[PDB]
Every structure is written in structure tokens, then in C-alpha cells.
Amino acid sequence: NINDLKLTLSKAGQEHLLRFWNELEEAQQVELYAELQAMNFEELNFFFQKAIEGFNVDARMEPVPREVLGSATRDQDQLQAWESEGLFQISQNKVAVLLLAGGQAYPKGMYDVGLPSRKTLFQIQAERILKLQQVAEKYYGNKCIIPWYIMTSGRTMESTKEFFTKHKYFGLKKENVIFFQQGMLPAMSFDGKIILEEKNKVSMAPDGNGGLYRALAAQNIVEDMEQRGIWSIHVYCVDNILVKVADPRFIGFCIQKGADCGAKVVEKTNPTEPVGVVCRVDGVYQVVEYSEISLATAQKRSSDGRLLFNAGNIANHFFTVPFLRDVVNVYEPQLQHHVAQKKIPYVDTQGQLIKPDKPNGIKMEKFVFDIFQFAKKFVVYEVLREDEFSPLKNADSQNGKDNPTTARHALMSLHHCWVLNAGGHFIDENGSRLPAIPRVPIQCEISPLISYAGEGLESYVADKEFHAPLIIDENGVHEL
Amino acid sequence: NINDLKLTLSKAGQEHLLRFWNELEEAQQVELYAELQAMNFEELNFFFQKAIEGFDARMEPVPREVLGSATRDQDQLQAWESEGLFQISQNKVAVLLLAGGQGTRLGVAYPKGMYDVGLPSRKTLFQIQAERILKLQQVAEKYYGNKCIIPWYIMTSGRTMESTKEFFTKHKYFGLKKENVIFFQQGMLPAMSFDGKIILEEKNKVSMAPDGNGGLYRALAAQNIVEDMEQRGIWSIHVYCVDNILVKVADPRFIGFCIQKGADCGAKVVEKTNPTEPVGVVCRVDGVYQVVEYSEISLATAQKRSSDGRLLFNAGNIANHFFTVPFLRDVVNVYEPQLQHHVAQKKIPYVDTQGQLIKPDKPNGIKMEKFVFDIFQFAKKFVVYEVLREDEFSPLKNADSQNGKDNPTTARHALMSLHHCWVLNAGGHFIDENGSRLPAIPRSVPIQCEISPLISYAGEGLESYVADKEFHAPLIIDENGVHEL
Ligand SMILES: CC(=O)N[C@H]1[C@@H](OP(=O)(O)OP(=O)(O)OC[C@H]2O[C@@H](n3ccc(=O)[nH]c3=O)[C@H](O)[C@@H]2O)O[C@H](CO)[C@H](O)[C@@H]1O
Ligand SMILES: CC(=O)N[C@H]1[C@@H](OP(=O)(O)OP(=O)(O)OC[C@H]2O[C@@H](n3ccc(=O)[nH]c3=O)[C@H](O)[C@@H]2O)O[C@H](CO)[C@H](O)[C@@H]1O
């Protein structure tokens, strides 16, 4: 019935949600009905109650102990051993990857950064997956698979799926790319009243990348992982053009250390850089998001002169399947919602659409890294920024950096260095050799299919000079 | 005597510079005649021979004994600062701005000093620098009680001299006295093709460009600038680059540090963390101190890391040096001639045989330049002072995220972010429209905060303005008070 909904709405004190029901057409009424039925108002009030209460952790924060910190630089003597371990896991079909792509206008993964090859982030990531499958198979002699779970939201589900089919899945098997949708949460005013965006539309938005755990349960994702025989899952953010998807070194490091949970970080050197920091609070590992840290804590220096909290989270995590299992149906409830005031477009009492110039409500979100505190063995792996982290944030968030152009330059500079490191050289139109840091930038792009992290370029560049822009793909060397 | 000049040019292998003489009007030939007459072709050939002929592994980090750190040595900051302010109060400090470069890469035809990065107050780099000088004159007068002066020497080039002077006069020298601002122009060098021929830009014009910021030393001689410093009784000179919006002009800490260490030469640096960052690195070769420019370092060296995990060569030059007047006196009268030219291959526009203008597709010649830090090697006592990037270095080098970073946007955001931090550290707070307190690192305003140097030089003196208060950004704090835009 449609009367049970009115009884429930009044039981939660959220009856106002049906104030324009008598002015709505059949189509409108059925569209709103399906939206309200899929909501747990009793639980939502509970959520708001706890969340709003948040209207100090800093004193309790402790640095990451050297005992759990691994470093690709300081521990380069172990890189080969870890990489081989991660490579073996991949060849045994025991490694899967999970992309967080529920955030929003079109899918960030479809961004064309302007590379000479013009590939999108999604494609670059897929070629790194394909490449690792190739390398592992040519190293252990067996076709292996790395499933690609992609968490999407109601805002990008349809759009993303069509983009992948249009591209034949970039060369991957459609059956190994799993799309699952993330849940939503209603915007609420400071008094705890769900906000109507339209006369027949509740104001909704994705429930944070931490909504991942509820989505896994809803779509039985964990069971699918256990069915495939996966043991390790690499979770990562979609906007980092340099992301080493299924990175064998990180995976090998975590497995070698017998961890059930791991976090990859880069050295944070600017106190106000917008990255959360890995730390320990009351004996348990956590990440204090950048928006929740105080200036005094963010600016604190240690004896050696570096920031005390310098483990910048780059949203690249390692989770064992069994660990995710326990989180999905045991710990999940313990996760709390982080709150943010927003200016939410809504329908006033006069049935008019208003765009407030002042916050009129809050948004609740769960964070993917809030499960670190439940791990039995947490580990941290430090890498170099120029090799693995160059995020692309929205236009209003760019501010000179973290934009399409800085992302493009970061990948091309990296590939340019791989060329020089493999004995290659660049020259001008007169054949004069160019310096490593010219006073063009030297445009250079190397497809992941050819090189994953700079290896296997000896045959293509050793003792050779090139005229940039240089491109090296599955079709050889091309000097545009 | 056009016949003598012809003979002089030909003996130097340069007679082609008069190739279009018979096509120029009487007026155009008098200009070419004067320009050529003011050139030393013999010297130019010698310079070309050394440069053309010039066609690592010995580098070493500086010993910890010569490197001081604002963070590691925080305990000594107060003493160094006191020494610096004392020097200033005794009228023993002058500053020297390098502004002979053009603002072309930025997309404009005027001097970078005049650029407006869009701050709330709309102030230019020149003005902000001027108020930092004024502030230290006032601060010093309050600690010691006497009125003091910090002479401002400004090196321009042929292409920035006129604009700069007119801009300053139009603004009343930003509050400073005209007699304490000294403008002097650096020299120029001609572009030359690989064969050794000086290049003509027009039938009657030699292709000329500023001779490098190291051309400062030759200019100091040609304008008798050192005599002017000695006459003023100056002991310490702070040399700095115009494009760094965060530059601490006449910084009493850096100056005091150098004085206490008995240095005659010092360089300020920030830690270089990215192997390919375009800053030179301070180091030493055969016991001699120097800077290896980013364009002359090899990738293997740039990438080298030490045990602690940081780059082996991590002392990044931010073009902020300290020189004493006696040392510059020796540079000008002895060392200068021993300074070498750095060569850059370039595509230079020229006039061909058929009298046609051409823009080469391949590099056709070279440009020679001297570097301001190449005198470190002659210092009797060289020291290095390391500071934090977010507090002291944010360069303006590119158009506007049409080259990535080091553009107007990042420069504006770096100054405002710094001032926002000052407010927070002094006990202030920022709030939204409903009085709710904003976080130190908000999810993307960015917070717009701008504090005049006349109020705070480096974050001090703000407690009476913001302790326990909350502000709606944009926040401006200047000589007229606190203003919430
Ligand atoms: C919570 C979190 O991870 N914060 C990290 C993330 O913050 P950010 O504020 O940069 O990003 P964000 O939390 O909005 O989203 C990060 C990733 O999560 C995805 N997403 C976001 C919301 C949602 O409901 N669903 C969803 O799937 C989004 O598509 C992206 O792939 O990145 C920074 C690096 O630049 C850091 O490492 C910050 O610590
Ligand atoms: C030679 C030198 O200092 N290199 C430094 C300078 O390189 P850059 O290549 O970034 O700059 P640059 O040498 O073109 O000029 C630096 C400063 O010198 C001035 N100038 C330049 C040429 C000239 O003929 N006359 C003149 O006065 C120019 O106006 C600016 O104030 O800045 C970087 C930081 O951003 C570093 O610290 C580099 O090591």
C-alpha cells in the first residue's frame, strides 16, 4: 500500500516528505514512492542523532612507529623479493583490484588529460592490469586473471558501463570487470529533517567511499571474491593518473609481512597539503582526514626537521579477503559518519526551488580507511611522489595544481626519466643532446603494455637518441 | 669614420654587420653606427671562443658545519634576528633586486615586478617588496629607537629600465624616499650563430639580450655602484630575485645568521624534494663552493638519495644571497673576468641575404650568460641557510596553469595560505555564513586572507588583532585596520 509509507514517515517524524503528494502526477508519485520505500527512516534518524552531536583527537595522535613502516627507497634491498612475491600471487589468480569510482559532470575515469595518445584514466588503468597479467604469465608460464571490481554510484553507474562496452573493455574480459553500485544518503537540515530537492525528489548523494562496505554486502561482492579464490584486494582512488594498479611491490610487501591490512603513503612535506595522515590514536591505527586536523598538529616538526605526521595517505590500500569478510558483517556498524555543512538546493514550503547562499543542512559520509582500526596486522608502505601520486581534483579544487595539466606533466616527466634511466637520450632538430631539466617540456609517453614501472625499455632506447614528442606503444617507437 | 669601423669589423670577422648599410636611411645608419661603436668585437670573439669550445661526478654536499636551518636551529633564531635588526638600525644594510629580466614567459611585455597576481588588495610584487623594507625600518626603529634606512638598489636592463622607473615615480616610490632607491642598468651581449657571426635582428639592428643575472658584476663597475655602497657605509647586501612573492626582503634572520658566522657570502635555500625541480643545487667541487644550475645537472646526480631517504643534493637555490661590500669590491676589481659564460642554444630571428626576416625552425646560434652565484667560489667564508618553502619561496615563472605551476594562481594562493596560517597561529579563526568555524584545511574555499607587511613581517604582531576572534573571509588586515570584504 501507499498508506503504510505515511504511517512510517509519521513514526520517524519525517512526514513532511509527503507535503506535495496531492500536487503530483501519477508518474511523479510513483517515482517518489520508490525512492522513499528504499529508505530506512528509523535508522536515518539514529544516524543524524550521532552525527550532529559532532557540532580532542589531536592530543591523542601518535606518529607511525618505524616497526610497521616499509619504504621503497630505504628498503630498496628488498624490492626484488617483494615484487616477485606479488607477481606470484597474481599468477596464481589470487589478486583482485577494487576501484572507488562512485564520486562525481561525467565519470572522472573518462577524463582526457591531453596525452599525445589521448588515453583516458580508465584505459591507462586497464592497460596496467593487462600488462601485469602479461608479465606474470611470461614469468610463470600460465594465463592469469586480475578481477577488476568497480564501485560506482547512482550518479555514474549508467554512464561508466556504456563507456566500457564502447571500448571492448580496453582489451580485458567483460566477465572479469565487476560493476556494483554504492548506497546513497539524504541531505538533512540542522534540525534533523530530510530535505526534498524537488517536489517529488529527496535530496540524495553517495554515502562516502566508506559506503563501500555496505555495498559489498548488498551485492554479495565478498562471496564473488571467495568464489574466484582471491586472497588480496588492492583498493585505490580513480583520479591518480600514476596509480600502480595491482602494484606487485606493495602487494608483495604486505603478504611478506603477513598483514591483513596495509596503506600506501607518500612523504607529506607541506603542512596544509590536503591528504589525510596515517597515525595511531589510543593504540589503534587510523587516518585523520585533512579536514579534521588542527593547524598545530599539521605543522609539528620532528627532530630530523621533517613533519612529525608525514605519512600522507594516497588512498591506495591492501585488504585480505578474510579481513573484508569480517568488516562486511561484523565491524561495519561501528563505523561512524563524518559530517559536512552544505548549501543544499531544496523546495521551500511555498513549493518553490531555492538555492541557499548559506548552509541549510549537513551531509553524512563514511570513509574507506575507517576500518584500519580493526586490523590484526596493519602495515604502511612509503613510496616516492613523482613515481606514484599525482591527483586530479575538480576545477574549484585545482587552484594551480591537482588539475588535468599537472596530471599530464607528471606522467610525461616520469616516462621521460624512464627513457634517460634506460640509457636513452633526447635531442633537438640539430642532433644536439638535451639536458635532463631543460631551461620543452620533453613530451614522452610510454604505454603500460610496454612498461609498467620503467622496466623492459633497453631494447627500445638504450644508446639511442630521440626527437620528442616520443611515444612507445604496442607498435614501436613513434616520434611525432 | 665609417671606414675605420668597417676595417675593425672585418678584421674581427664581423663585416657582414654592415651588409645592408646602403639600404638604410641616414637616420637608421647613425643608430647602427652608434650601437656597433659601443661593442668590443675583440672581446666578443674571445668570449665566443671560450663558449664554443665548451662542447659532474665530482660534486659533494656542503659540510654540516656551514649549513644552518631555521627549523633545526630554532633556538638560535631570536639571536640571529636581533643581530639582523641591529645591523639594519645602524644603516649597515642595503638590498639589491635583480629585475633585468623580461616578463615574456608570463605572457606580458612589462616587468614582472608590476604584475598583479589578483590578491584582495590588488598589490603588485614591487609594492609588497617595498612595504617589507618599510616595515623593517619601523620595527628596527622601535627596538633601538633610531630612524634607519635600507637603501634599495634595483638592476634593470635595456628592456625594463624605462617602465620600472615610470611605475615607481607614478606610485611615489611606495612610501620610501626617492633618494634611497637606486636604479642601474645591466649590460647586453649579442646573439651569435654557431659559425661565430654576430646576428642581425633587422637590417640596422643587432640581435641583443641581457647578459645574465651574473651581468650584475660588470654593471656594478660601469655604474660605480660599489662606491655608492661604501659611501653610504653599507656592510651587508641582500641580493634577490624579483619573482618570488614570498621573498623576505632584508630578512634580519638570514642576515643575522650570516653576520654571527662571520661570512662574507651566503645563500638561502629550501629543501629540494623532487629530482626534476628547476632550481640549482648548492654544493662544492675540490673544496670550492658553487651552484650547479638545474640545466647542467645530470638525471643520475639529481636523483641520488642519501641514507635518510632524501636527495643527496637537496639544498635548492632560491636566488637569495648575502654578500658583504668588501667581497663585492673584490669581485668587481679582480674576480669578475674569471667568471665564465653559460651557453644556451637558441632559435634566433634574423635577416637573410635577400633582406628577409626569418624565424628558424632549428637552433641557429647561442646566447651567453653569466650567473649571479658563480662568485660563491671566490668567497672567503661561505655559509648556507635553509628555510621552509611555504614561508619563503613561491616563484612566478609561467603564464597561468598553461604551464602547470609557478604561475599567478599558485603565487596568490601561496601568499594567502601563509597569512591564513598566521591568523590561526595567533589565535584567530575563520567562520562561514552561519558562524560555524571552518577547518584549517577545508574541503574544496580556499580562504582569502591578506596581511600587509606594514602590520606583520612574518606572522608576529597579530595577537591584538585576532586572538579569540572569528572572521568571514576575505580578510584583509592593513594600516587602516581589519576589513572583512
Ligand atoms: C576519504 C579519503 O579517501 N580521503 C582521501 C582522498 O580525499 P579526497 O577529498 O581527495 O577525495 P574523496 O574522498 O572525495 O574521494 C576519493 C575517492 O573516493 C571516491 N568516492 C568518494 C565519495 C563516494 O561517495 N564514493 C567514492 O567512490 C572518489 O570517486 C575517489 O576515487 O584523496 C586524497 C588524495 O588526493 C587523500 O588520500 C585523502 O585522505
Ligand atoms: C641564474 C639563477 O639565478 N638561477 C636561479 C633562477 O633561475 P631562473 O631560470 O628561474 O631565472 P632567471 O635566471 O631567468 O632569472 C632569475 C632572476 O634574475 C633576473 N635576471 C635574469 C637574467 C638577466 O639577464 N638579468 C636578470 O636580472 C630575473 O629578472 C630574475 O629576478 O631562479 C630559480 C628559482 O626560481 C633558482 O634559484 C635558479 O637556480
DSSP secondary structure string, B216-275?
Answer: HHHHHHHTTHHHHHHHTT--EEEEEETTBTT--TT-HHHHHHHHHTT-SEEEEEEE--ST
Ligand 2: atom nearest CA of B212 is 24
Domain B1-427 listed as CATH 3.40.190.10: no
Pairing of strands A311-320, A232-237: antiparallel
Instruction: Please state, in angstroms and as integers, the Cα–Cα distance from residue B384 to each residue in A183, A304, B322, B439, following that order.
Output: 56, 17, 10, 36
A73/B305 CB distance under 8 A: yes
- On the 0-12 / 13-18 / 19+ scale of CB atoms within 10 A, B128 is buried
Q: Rounded to an integer, what distance in angstroms lies between the CA atom of residue A184 and that of residue A73?
A: 41
The whole-angstrom separation of Cα B257 and Cα B266 is: 9
Distance (Å) of CA B369 to CA A246, B81, B186: 49, 35, 12
- Cβ-Cβ contacts under 8 Å, A299 against chain B: 421
Residue type, B26: E
For strand B470-471 and strand B475-478, is the pairing parallel, antiparallel, or unpaired? unpaired
Q: Report chain A residues whose CB lies below 8 A from the CB of B432.
A: 341, 358-359
Main-chain phi, psi angles of A418, to 5 degrees: -60, -40
Q: Which residue of B has its CA nearest to A55?
A: B436
Cβ–Cβ of B297/A437 closer than 8 Å?
yes
Say yes or no: CB of residue A275 within 6 Å of ligand 1.
Answer: yes
Task: Report d(CA A464, CA A333) in Å as an integer.
Answer: 59
A38 CB contacts (<8 Å, ≥6 apart)?
none
* CA–CA gap between residue B67 and residue A281 (Å, rounded): 36
Q: Which fold has domain A1-423?
A: Spore Coat Polysaccharide Biosynthesis Protein SpsA; Chain A (3.90.550)
A298 and B344 within 8 Å at the Cβ level: the answer is no
Structure's resolution in angstroms: 2.3
Q: What is the dihedral of CA B109, B114, B118, B121, to 10 degrees?
A: -160
Largest CA distance in chain B: 83
Query: CA of B332 to nearest chain A CA: how many angstroms apart?
Result: 28
Closest alpha carbon to A319 in A276, A379, A266, A265: A379
Inter-chain contact B446–A358, Cβ cutoff 8 Å?
Answer: no
Q: At what angle do helices B252-260 and B77-89 cross, to 10 degrees?
A: 100
Closest CA to B255 of B415, B455, B92: B92
Atom of ligand 2 nearest to the CA of B369: 24
CA distance A222 to chain B (A): 32
Task: Report the largest interatomic distance among the alpha carbons of chain A, rounded to a whole angstrom.
Answer: 82
Chain A residues lying within 8 Å of B409, measured CB to CB: 399-400
CA distances from A153 to A34, A104, A111, B76 (A): 17, 9, 17, 55
Does ligand 1 come within 6 angstroms of the Cβ of A387?
A: no
Q: Nearest by CB to B295, which of A305, A400, A435?
A: A435
Q: Which of A209, A366, A382, A396 to mutate to test the pocket of ligand 1 (most atoms within 8 A of CB)?
A: A209
- In the numeric block, the cell 614582472 is attached to B112
A312 is in an annotated binding site: no
Phi, psi for residue B113 in degrees, rounded to 5: -55, -30
- Please tell me the residue having the least CA distance from ligand 2 atom 37: B318
Cα A299 from chain centre: 26
The H-or-E segment that residue B318 falls in is strand B315-324
Place of cell 674569471: B338
Question: Does residue A276 have its Cβ closer than 6 Å to ligand 1?
Answer: yes
What would you report as the CA-atom Rg of chain B, rounded to the nearest whole angstrom? 24
C-alpha cell at B169: 615615480
> Which residues in chain B are contacts of A405 at CB distance < 8 A?
401-402, 404
Protein residues with CB under 6 Å of any ligand 2 atom: B 98-101, 155, 157, 186, 210-213, 215, 241-243, 279-280, 293, 317-319, 371-372, 395, 397
Nearest to B16 by CA among B36, B42, B40, B34: B36
Tell me the nearest-neighbour CA distance from A227 into chain B, angstroms: 39
Across the interface, whether the CB atoms of A405 and B410 are under 8 A apart is answered: no
Extents of the domains making up chain A? 1-423, 424-480
Number of alpha helices (DSSP H) and beta strands (DSSP E) in chain B: 14, 24
Are the beta carbons of B476 and B120 closer than 8 angstroms?
yes
A420 to chain B: nearest residue by CA?
A: B299
Among B96, B98, B155, B213, the mutation site with the greatest number of ligand 2 atoms within 8 A of its Cβ is B213
Instruction: Tell whether the torsion through CA atoms of A168, A170, A172 and A174 is positive or negative.
Output: negative
The alpha carbons of chain A give a radius of gyration, in whole angstroms, of 24
Cβ distance B442 to A295 less than 8 Å, yes or no, reads no
CATH number listed for the domain at residues A424-480: 2.10.10.100
- By alpha-carbon position, which residue is closest to atom 9 of ligand 1? B443
**CA nearest A437 in B: which residue?**
B295
Q: Report the separation in Å between the CA atom of A209 and the middle of ligand 1, taken as the mean of its atom positions.
A: 6
Chain CA centroid to CA B399, Å: 18
The identity of residue B92, as a single letter, is K
Chain B residues whose CB is inside 8 A of the A437 CB are 276, 278, 294-295, 297, 302
Phi, psi of A109 (to 5 degrees): -60, -20
* Ligand nearest, relative to CA of residue B370: 2
Cβ within 8 Å, pair B345-A432: yes
Contact residues, chain A, for B294 at CB < 8 Å: 437, 439
Give the H or E element holding residue B85.
helix B77-89
* Strand spans (E) along B122-172: 152-156
Contact B309 A396 (CB under 8 A): no
Question: Which one of 3.30.2270.10, 3.40.309.10, 2.10.10.100, 3.30.499.10 gives the CATH number of domain B428-485?
Answer: 2.10.10.100
Which member of A386, A417, A438 has the closest CB to residue B295?
A: A438
Q: What's the CA-to-centroid distance between A430 and ligand 2, angstroms? A: 27
CA A275 / ligand 1 centre spacing (Å): 10
Beta carbons of A399 and B446 less than 8 angstroms apart: yes
Ligand having the closest approach to the CA of B297: 2
Nearest CA to ligand 1 atom 37: A314
Nearest ligand to the CA of B243 is 2
Answer yes or no: do B297 and A386 touch at CB < 8 A.
Answer: no
- Residue B386's closest chain A neighbor by CA? A305
Q: Does the Cβ of A313 fall within 6 Å of ligand 1? A: yes
| Residue B243: CB atoms within 10 Å | 22
| DSSP β-ladder status, B429-430 and B470-471 | parallel
* Cα separations in angstroms, B322 against A241, A341, B68, B202, B396: 42, 49, 14, 41, 22
Q: What ligand 2 atom has the least distance to the C-alpha of B291?
A: 39
Give the separation between CA B210 and CA B101, rounded to whole angstroms: 7
* Cβ distance of A295 and B440 shorter than 8 Å: yes
Between the CA of residue A82 and those of A73, A85, A249, A260, B171, what are the distances in Å? Answer: 13, 5, 5, 16, 64
Nearest to A359 among B344, B409, B432 (CB): B432
Q: What backbone torsions phi and psi does residue B92 show, to the nearest 5 degrees?
A: -110, 15
A176 close to A152: Cβ distance less than 8 angstroms: no
